[PDB]
Ligand binder design. Structure first.
Ligand SMILES: *[C@@H]1O[C@H](CO)[C@@H](O[C@@H]2O[C@H](CO)[C@@H](O[C@@H]3O[C@H](CO)[C@@H](O)[C@H](O)[C@@H]3O)[C@H](O)[C@H]2NC(C)=O)[C@H](O)[C@H]1NC(C)=O
Ligand SMILES: *[C@@H]1O[C@H](CO)[C@@H](O)[C@H](O)[C@H]1NC(C)=O
Lengths: 49, 49
């Protein structure tokens, strides 16, 4: 995917690598080497008038 | 008029209240406080944290 990664405050269980938001899309990952939880924020976009 | 004397008819509850920064009447202020709106048309770049 495409997005901005930031340090997350989410507490993932030992068997959880990914998190989901209220609309059932990915909003967090566990780094496979550091085991840090990172939040994913889509890069800013919008309309142009 | 600044006098606001109408022969005993008190319109203070429907006329703008200058004390409030929105200059809405007490009834209008009450009506705005009663309705709950989350889908604001404001710029929303204050989440993702
Ligand atoms: C038009 O109607 C409004 C509402 O009835 C009048 O305002 C009200 O005036 C009374 C008396 O001044 C206020 O009561 C007092 O409030 C103070 C607050 O500190 C309290 O210490 C007193 O013991 C007494 O309870 C009342 O709160 C006030 N209400 C509002 C919403 O302003 C107004 O004076 C009327 N105007 C005319 C021209 O008749
Ligand atoms: C990979 O090796 C590094 C060595 O510094 C270690 O810190 C990291 O946790 C290791 N990752 C896995 C998945 O074993």
């Amino acid at each position: 995917g495409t997005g901005v990664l930031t340090k997350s405050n989410k507490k993932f269980l030992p068997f959880q690598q990914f998190g989901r938001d209220i609309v059932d899309t990915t909003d967090a990952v566990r780094d496979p080497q550091t085991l840090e939880i990172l939040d994913i924020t889509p890069c800013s976009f919008g309309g142009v008038s | 008029p600044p006098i606001k004397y109408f022969g005993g008819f008190n319109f203070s509850q429907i006329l703008p209240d200058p004390s409030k920064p929105s200059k809405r009447s007490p009834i209008e202020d009450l009506l705005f406080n009663k309705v709950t709106l989350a889908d604001a048309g404001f710029i929303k770049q204050y989440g993702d944290c």
